Amino acid sequence: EVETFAFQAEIAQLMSLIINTFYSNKEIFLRELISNSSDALDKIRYESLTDPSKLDSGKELHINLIPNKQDRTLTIVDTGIGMTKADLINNLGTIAKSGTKAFMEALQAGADISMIGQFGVGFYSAYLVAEKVTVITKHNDDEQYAWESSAGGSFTVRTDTGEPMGRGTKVILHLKEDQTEYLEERRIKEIVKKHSQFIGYPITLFVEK
Ligand SMILES: CC(C)NCCCn1c(Cc2cc3c(cc2I)OCO3)nc2c(N)nc(F)nc21
């Protein structure tokens, strides 16, 4: 049962801008995704302080970076708070609409794509290097979902019957043919050290094979 939705015009426009604008500093996508994971981890930790049972789905708070050359994917995994179906289909888009407007106005004023995170829409920077993005997420008290989009103005959502993850989010980046450098251990280590060296959670970079 796969449902297809249309991105709001503003988000579709943002994605097209990210995909079409000539901008060489693409590596910043990783920092934005790790930052999103860190925020999600901060939230579940905060909520667990008043309701310890929210960690029954997993006490470990961390981030895993998993590259796979055979599938040509780079997956950013976290055990943060996770997203509900409502987040994926309506709420995150509602919030992203205003962030997108501010970002594009900032761009015409002289800002550049690397500052996308200051507008709450850094997630979409994933399209700087991925032709398709698959997001698997599980929030307590909601089912595990699989969100997916190759841009083009639409995305899909389905209940994920794959391997249960407990709680958290996995952003699976199906890399563009000319962006496989982000599957190399050397490259990922360099980027994490450069832009995400102070994240307050363990970041484990898995090795290939
Ligand atoms: C309340 C706050 C935590 N929401 C953050 C924005 C959504 N967000 C995002 C950013 C985001 C993710 C999307 C998305 C829109 C956005 I913005 O479309 C489907 O996947 N990343 C995560 C993440 N790793 N974990 C959790 F819990 N939330 C994610």
Per domain, the residue ranges of the chain are 1-209
**Residues 153 and 197 sit within 8 Å (Cβ to Cβ):** no
Residue nearest to atom 20 of ligand 1 (CA): 135
Give the CATH number of domain 1-209: 3.30.565.10
Determine the Cα–Cα distance for residues 35 and 41; give it in Å rounded to an integer. Answer: 10
Determine the Cα–Cα distance for residues 167 and 162; give it in Å rounded to an integer. Answer: 14
For residue 10, report the distance from its CA to the centre of ligand 1, in Å. 17
Determine the Cα–Cα distance for residues 89 and 189; give it in Å rounded to an integer. Answer: 33
Q: Which segments are annotated as binding site for ATP?
A: 36, 78, 97, 123
Please state, in angstroms and as integers, the Cα–Cα distance from residue 148 to each residue in 5, 89, 133, 134, 176, following that order: 10, 11, 6, 4, 16
Helix boundaries (H) for the chain: 9-20, 28-48, 85-86, 92-108, 185-195
The rounded radius of gyration (Å) of the Cα atoms in the chain is 17
Number of H helices, E strands in the chain: 5, 8
Method by which this entry was solved = X-ray
Say how many residues make up the chain.
209
Pairing of strands 203-205, 144-149: unpaired
Determine the Cα–Cα distance for residues 63 and 67; give it in Å rounded to an integer. Answer: 13
Pocket test for ligand 1, best of 5, 36, 156 (most atoms within 8 A of CB): 36
End-to-end CA distance of the chain: 33
Residue nearest to atom 8 of ligand 1 (CA): 36
Q: With a 6 A CB cut-off, is 155 part of the ligand 1 pocket? A: no
Please state, in angstroms and as integers, the Cα–Cα distance from residue 161 to each residue in 59, 165, 184, 187, following that order: 23, 11, 30, 33
Q: With a 6 A CB cut-off, is 81 part of the ligand 1 pocket? A: yes
Residue nearest to atom 12 of ligand 1 (CA): 123
Give the SS3 label for residue 34: helix
**Residues 96 and 87 sit within 8 Å (Cβ to Cβ):** no
Burial call 158-195: b when 16+ CB within 10 Å, e when fewer: eebeeeebebbbbbbbbbbeebeebbeeeebeebbeeb
Strand partners of residue 155: 5
**Residues 69 and 207 sit within 8 Å (Cβ to Cβ):** no
